[PDB]
């Protein structure tokens, strides 16, 4: 047992409370190796390997037949990380024995994990042999956020909808729906978003997140500036460029505000362009404009000093100056490593240079981003390897750090961190 | 030995498909040690090194005194890995038994090296002592394809002069006597290229290839708004930076919806910025502008669904947007490592990611870009190097895959790929 | 023999810790150059901008009336979130080196006693020459003032080197102005004569043994040739007193930056050009805490520049870590651009790494300055020297030693090349 395994068994023991996820939080769990493999992670993949789309969303057929189809596919993609975090998933959470899978196995497969799964406790189960004790959900803004233990899946209110898509009349009617405003006007749409706020508080939300495309740049904007635009949205007109861009800095200026308000912290995802990839597979069609800086947002880290911003970066070249305005505004939080950098070529370095020069209380580890249970562990694990090297080479081999010191630092990255940035409203 | 030079030695053995050069198949390998030192890669970094532009390119002297006046700027150069493919090369093709080329062993070798040169049939020795089988031209769109075994000497339509050069009167002059065409006006253009591809084809072709600058940003282009531009252009006019990005964009949306037609692959090379060194030796003045993204070329993968781009970045930092690319469009293949790229501390991170995160069957492995056949194996080999230590730090250690399946991988990067992905039109 | 500790790599480091330096880089005042007590190492902006950062406000840092003692006191109290920190690194082993501390880490159990010694060693009549003795360094470059007179101290020890952002960027400002004409008695309303005393100042700075000019320049800087013409308007209306539009500042700054390089190439003076700097972004950070920087830049920016002074030698720092490929590339082709050290935020291991391993393998070996110290006060040399020591023998031992199956000694003299013998043949003054 190396040096690193053994620090890395010791990450393994912390009990995580996962900062960021998809998670439905009424069928938090798969069913069947659909739910599992016919997850984007693998679909866009076997679609970019050469499968046609037509071929994996095929109208009416089962879920079964969904996988099998897929497994045809996964030979072109053995070597990616993401069907280790299949294989190992597997193993973990299903006793799988084999170190791939193929169309020779998976129904065997298929047919028991199915059964495992419509156990009573399946979801427990998953919780318990992933270190789970909680899970950040990303809630719409009009979600009742009922029916579910609050303090298990933890509320956060997602606010792209309502910061870039007012343009769309299906978002307009569910604001309406959701709060009795009449939101034509600033005044109106104010207290629809305080009344959004206010419903997710009182359900225990602990965060807001956003995901901000490479050209937003956020600044102030008066209500008689937003006035124009928020009127030709309601009215049904379609917004030019310049009003579009003004209403979401209006819209997005004002959750900063009620994030302050209400101490909440405004988890910032940068730098994703929606719908790339025209003729993707579903959830699979999102790339990036590399093009970015944090310099984009000095205007909303200077005038929010009392919100915290958890901040991932989606372009690689981008962690560099995260870590840099993470180390210089005490409301910059480097948070976790996120969707095309969440891979070891690129978290090992980024998770480095995050360790040794932002300090150990700005500086949340990692989370899941996933859509169901069972993916947690095997990229939760994936992040505790890379993390477990950093910590060795770093800390205990490079000053002289006990493995228990060391340990320290990585349960305060993983956890700690999670519970003093995240306290609650 | 060591674990990595095992699996090397197995890289090693494997014979290669060159996907892509700049060898002339009448003048393949060198004839002289002038051939190989007086190329740009040791005249950039001699003149570099601050060895005068004037006294490299000195008119009135042969080869083997410009050989000389090389050798003497060498001494600043002994760290470069280029000066190791160097020495490497003259062990291996030259018996050369000194780690260096210095003032006084560098004119035994030359006579030497030229007697071994002269032989008849250096070329064949040459190619088997590379494991090389078959090497990717990229030809001349006016090429005659004549005289060689094009099975051989693959040819690939070098499109460079068609997209950017229309304006120079040699090239519309090249291109009507090739096609027979008068392309002033968009329809006749287009025909003329179609004439090009049916050349082309008619020699064995397996794809074309362009180098693009920073700013390029592919669109579809409309009749009326190219036949504007294409005019001037054939009335001997300077054309404005929009006529001729108009232009640009017309001819190269002309070729990809060719490749389509003919089933051939479109090589991009992105970023490069011709003569930014103005005073550089020949074929040393072009660097770049690394603000680049592949989002600018979102249009055209999009509605080239049945073109594979084979992609080069010249910039480091573009790999990683080459790896999400490559993951998400079934239509971009990660291409090697292009150029200032192509050293050991930039190919690892690039090799590393692409095949942890990309699917193994639209990865290429390496070409070599060479300009004599004495190059290739130097830079195939500090290739092999790499991907060996990539294999297996994270197949054999990392997944616990067997030597032979990591080497099955490899064998897919460096030729399985070049065959799918370059089968013929 | 070796002690079993020792690792090939800190063999290889060993040797290069006896590398008698030339600091290519530095802020010294050399009318005080070392530290008096701990509140001039701790109180430095490396580890406030760090305290502050970590939640301690700054008017608790930075509260008026408080002693140096009490300030660091406070200061101690927050370490507690900085202690994975490369910059707490350097302190501990700092402290170690000099102070004789013993401990792992700096507390408030602990830092009033370390205070109290390290005062008591600093207080030594030799103290300056000890810390230069202990840390290798022979001579260190300075960043003057334009209007300093550098004859007040030792010109060979402490090694002069025009600071020029002020000239370029701030004219703007009366007290440059007034500056620049009591230093060099001129009217500096017209183009010729601005050009003239700048001209002074080259000729001042070069007869008191000045090796460089150096600049800080932001990310959206362009240089251009500039006419006397095209500068005469901004320049007249600097020195009337007006409020210049961004147009006139762009054109005069880039006029001045022209003039500066052609200078350079007159004497023969590298120009060292640290790219990439946004001054102010954070407007509420404690004292030399507020910059930051955007990385969307390019050398390409830099071409003018770089094609129309080939007799000048531009040492680069480039701030953002993106853009260390980008000057691998340009030193790479360009004569004239020269790698310089690692700046700021992108002196940390993790970075000086890659960029370190892919100079020395790209870019020619004479054309390659491994580092400077940045420092402020001179017991800030030895731990960033030591950080990247250990990295410059790491990259020496892999891809050297074992990469190309070099000798150590080869290795340790490529080593010595990168930290000395570059500094020496690079800078060997107008
Ligand atoms: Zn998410
Ligand atoms: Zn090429
Ligand atoms: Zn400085």
């Known amino acids: 047992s190396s ?48 499968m046609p789309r037509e071929v994996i969303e095929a109208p009416g057929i089962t879920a079964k037949e969904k996988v099998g189809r897929i497994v045809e ?11 280790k975090w299949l294989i190992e998933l597997c193993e973990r959470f299903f006793g799988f024995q084999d170190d791939r899978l193929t169309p020779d196995n998976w129904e065997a497969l298929y047919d028991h994990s199915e059964k495992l799964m419509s156990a009573p406790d399946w979801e427990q189960t998953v919780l318990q042999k992933s270190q789970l004790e909680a899970v950040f959900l990303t809630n719409d803004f ?41 939101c034509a006007t600033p005044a109106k749409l104010i207290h629809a978003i305080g009344q959004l706020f206010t419903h997710f508080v009182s359900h225990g939300a602990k965060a807001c997140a956003i995901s901000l495309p490479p050209d937003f740049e956020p600044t102030p904007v008066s209500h008689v500036d937003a006035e124009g635009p928020l009127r030709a949205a309601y009215a049904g007109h379609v917004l030019t460029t310049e009003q579009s861009q003004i209403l979401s800095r209006f819209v997005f200026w004002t959750i900063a505000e009620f994030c302050s308000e209400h ?64 180390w210089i505004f005490p409301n910059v939080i480097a948070n976790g490593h996120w969707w095309y950098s969440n891979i070891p070529a ?10 040794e020069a932002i300090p150990r209380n700005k500086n949340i580890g990692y989370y899941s981003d996933m859509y169901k249970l069972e993916f947690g562990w095997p990229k939760f694990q994936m992040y505790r390897r890379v993390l477990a090297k950093v910590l060795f080479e770093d800390f205990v081999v490079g000053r002289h750090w006990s493995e228990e010191r060391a340990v320290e630092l990585g349960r305060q990255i993983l956890r700690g961190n999670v519970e003093t940035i995240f306290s609650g409203a």
């Open 263 to 326: 101490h909440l912290p405004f988890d910032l995802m940068i730098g994703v362009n929606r719908r790339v990839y025209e003729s993707g597979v579903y959830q699979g069609q999102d790339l990036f404009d590399q093009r970015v800086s944090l310099y984009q947002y000095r205007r909303l880290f200077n005038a929010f000093p009392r919100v915290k911003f958890p901040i991932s970066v989606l372009a690689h070249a981008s962690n560099m100056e995260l870590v840099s305005y993470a």
């Open 346 to 355: 690129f978290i090992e370095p980024d998770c480095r240079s995050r360790l």
């Open 3 to 50: 040096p690193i395994d053994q620090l890395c068994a010791q990450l393994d023991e912390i009990v995580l409370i996962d900062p960021h996820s998809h998670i439905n939080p009424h069928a938090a769990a798969s069913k069947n190796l659909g739910d599992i493999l016919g997850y984007h992670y693998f679909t866009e993949l076997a679609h970019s390997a050469g």
């Open 142 to 182: 009009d979600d009742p956020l009922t029916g579910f233990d609050t303090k298990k899946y933890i509320p956060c209110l997602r606010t792209d909808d309502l910061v870039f898509h007012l343009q769309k009349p299906e978002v307009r009617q569910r604001l309406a729906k959701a709060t009795g405003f009449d």
């Open 73 to 83: 596919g996964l030979a072109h993609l053995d070597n990616t990380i993401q069907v």
